[PDB]
Design a protein around this ligand. Structure first.
Ligand SMILES: NCCC[C@H](N)CC(=O)N[C@@H]1[C@H](O)[C@@H](OC(N)=O)[C@@H](CO)O[C@H]1NC1=N[C@@H]2C(=O)NC[C@@H](O)[C@H]2N1
Ligand SMILES: NCCC[C@H](N)CC(=O)N[C@@H]1[C@H](O)[C@@H](OC(N)=O)[C@@H](CO)O[C@H]1NC1=N[C@@H]2C(=O)NC[C@@H](O)[C@H]2N1
Lengths: 172, 171
């Protein structure tokens, strides 16, 4: 019980904001576009890519969960979003604080997302991940997500141009 | 044979009747691997009948209309601009059942392209179900290529079993 999980309250919103999800990676997922399909291959990059997410990301059925340590600091969060149309719970964000990884916070937050999904009658969880976010992709694969598609054009004209939006899902 | 203009309130009821329901002897089959996605056009026998659902789950917006002699709508396109990624979404483009093979598709998409360059768009983008081979062939003809897909988009919908394919082209 190193970490407790609960619905986020107003005092958590400011702590959530500071966990921006910025990462370093020695690998990226390269997207190869053919006329008849798309291939993902993990490739080493030297020196390591430093990715800071932009301040402008282009943005009852909503919910934010938070992982809290003994001193009351937010160690992680997930913001989820339900669309009844296709029974999709979108994992809009999931982050673990830099110094709190390898302690089952990721799994715990996703388990709370899954609880909300079954509460709303969702058929699948779904998330967007940039092809350069190899650490997150490995984390999502570990938690049972698989690639369900991509949009190689989504980040065109954005601060993230050169990257591809990869889509992952899992049933519940 | 056909003139193009911005759609007016009296066109809304005619636009509604043009749902784009089709028959096809082929579909684009989606193969999911752990490391990617493959699209292969495959014959289906007997022909697939696709009726689009009434519930589709839905300055920078614009609707164009193709008009014949006698002033009847022969087709339309609704487009949508997002400055964030300079994307003009072709939200819908349909030609009336009896008016195909007359360059209405091309004409409507040319009006979409004019709006894109007017707004400074970097690319056009559309969604098409994998079973809509006729539309996919039309879009390929007009210069669109596949830029991705979402095999999970239609889960829990009337269209479950189909995959949402994404196509784009630069301006
Ligand atoms: N920020 C922490 C991570 C947040 C989550 N993982 C969600 C995510 O992936 N957001 C990414 C990320 O903010 C960043 O992408 C890169 N590569 O940095 C920017 C591009 O600059 O695009 C975002 N994507 C978007 N898709 C949405 C869309 O289609 N319509 C509406 C609008 O919401 C769109 N924004
Ligand atoms: N009439 C011709 C179609 C013209 C266009 N290309 C529009 C299109 O493709 N609509 C399809 C089509 O209505 C149908 O799909 C099948 N397979 O029939 C249903 C599945 O029931 O899903 C629609 N898609 C959607 N995507 C959107 C989304 O992501 N969020 C919000 C909302 O807008 C969503 N709706």
């Amino acid at each position: 019980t190193t970490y407790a999980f609960r619905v986020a309250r107003p005092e958590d919103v400011e702590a959530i904001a500071a966990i921006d999800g910025s990462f370093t990676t020695g690998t990226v997922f390269q997207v190869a576009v053919a006329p008849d399909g798309f291939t993902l291959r993990e490739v080493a990059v030297d020196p390591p890519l430093v990715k800071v997410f932009p301040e402008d990301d282009g943005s009852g059925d909503r919910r934010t969960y938070v992982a809290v340590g003994a001193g009351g600091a937010v160690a992680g969060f997930t913001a989820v979003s339900y669309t009844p149309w296709n029974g999709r719970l979108t994992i809009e964000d999931i982050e673990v604080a830099p110094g709190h990884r390898g302690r089952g916070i990721g799994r715990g937050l996703m388990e709370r997302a899954a609880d909300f999904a079954r509460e709303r009658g969702a058929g699948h969880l779904w998330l967007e991940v940039t092809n350069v976010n190899a650490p997150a992709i490995h984390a999502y694969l570990r938690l049972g997500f698989t690639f369900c598609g991509l949009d190689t054009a989504l980040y065109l004209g954005t601060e993230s141009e050169g990257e591809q939006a990869l889509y992952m899902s899992m049933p519940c």
